[PDB]
Amino acid sequence: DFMLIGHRGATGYTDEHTIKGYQMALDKGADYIELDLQLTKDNKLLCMHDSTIDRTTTGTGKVGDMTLSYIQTNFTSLNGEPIPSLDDVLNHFGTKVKYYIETKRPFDANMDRELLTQLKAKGLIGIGSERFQVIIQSFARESLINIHNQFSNIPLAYLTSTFSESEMDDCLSYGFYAIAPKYTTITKELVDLAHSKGLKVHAWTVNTKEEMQSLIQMGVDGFFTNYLDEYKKI
Numbered sequence: 561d562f563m564l565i566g567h568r569g570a571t572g573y574t575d576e577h578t579i580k581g582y583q584m585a586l587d588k589g590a591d592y593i594e595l596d597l598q599l600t601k602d603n604k605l606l607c608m609h610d611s612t613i614d615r616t617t618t619g620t621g622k623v624g625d626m627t628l629s630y631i632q633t634n635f636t637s638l639n640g641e642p643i644p645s646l647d648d649v650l651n652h653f654g655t656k657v658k659y660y661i662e663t664k665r666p667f668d669a670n671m672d673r674e675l676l677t678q679l680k681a682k683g684l685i686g687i688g689s690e691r692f693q694v695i696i697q698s699f700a701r702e703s704l705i706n707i708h709n710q711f712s713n714i715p716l717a718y719l720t721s722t723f724s725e726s727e728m729d730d731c732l733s734y735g736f737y738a739i740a741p742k743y744t745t746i747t748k749e750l751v752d753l754a755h756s757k758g759l760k761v762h763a764w765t766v767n768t769k770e771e772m773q774s775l776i777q778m779g780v781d782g783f784f785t786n787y788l789d790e791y792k793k794i
């Protein structure tokens with residue numbers, strides 16, 4: 561009844577968005593590994609939070625300006641792990657793990673298409689797939705609506721830095737499964753209102769046991785954390 565999400569893998573303990581980090585998240589008790597995706601010049605999907613590789617890799621530049629091959633052959637994560645593609649992660653873990661996958665902005669129909677192509681190739685969506693094995697999240701309503709039009713049974717989470725009744729109503733209108741608000745905007749009254757509308761609430765990004773306890777008392781259905789070991793201390 562509660563979803564513990566490893567934010568970019570196990571970010572508090574190791575490099576974000578590495579297969580080593582995704583594995584560490586699973587080892588530390590995450591229900592879901594969380595991927596952020598950026599579109600390469602050749603319309604492949606890179607596990608990368610920022611539009612640019614400058615902060616987290618040995619390289620620089622916009623992901624959209626380089627081919628997947630150029631990025632993976634020339635650069636590594638800060639501490640030397642490979643920079644994984646969506647394909648690399650799905651090939652590594654297959655149907656053994658649950659994925660919480662963000663389409664980063666700007667909205668791009670090519671990103672949505674490539675995401676659905678890679679998931680379908682592993683049987684993670686469409687016929688015979690387990691509901692909740694993949695949740696897709698975005699700040700871009702356009703990405704979630706486009707995906708919902710193509711694969712109506714994938715649970716979708718709308719990412720927001722606010723938590724208003726108008727946003728909950730939009731989630732209902734477009735058939736989204738969850739609203740995913742910044743955790744400091746959440747109150748028990750707002751969670752109860754979301755629940756009354758048939759929405760789940762997935763809070764991000766909570767990093768202390770005290771703040772985890774507060775969110776659980778408010779009745780959130782899940783949260784994203786950098787520090788999975790803190791959940792075992794609640």
Ligand SMILES: O=P(O)(O)OC[C@H](O)CO
Pocket residue numbers: 567596609662697719740764765784
């Ligand atoms: O860390 P960000 O910037 O992707 O913020 C959203 C949370 O990670 C939940 O996807």
Ligand SMILES: [Ca+2]
Pocket residue numbers: 594595596662
């Ligand atoms: Ca994210």
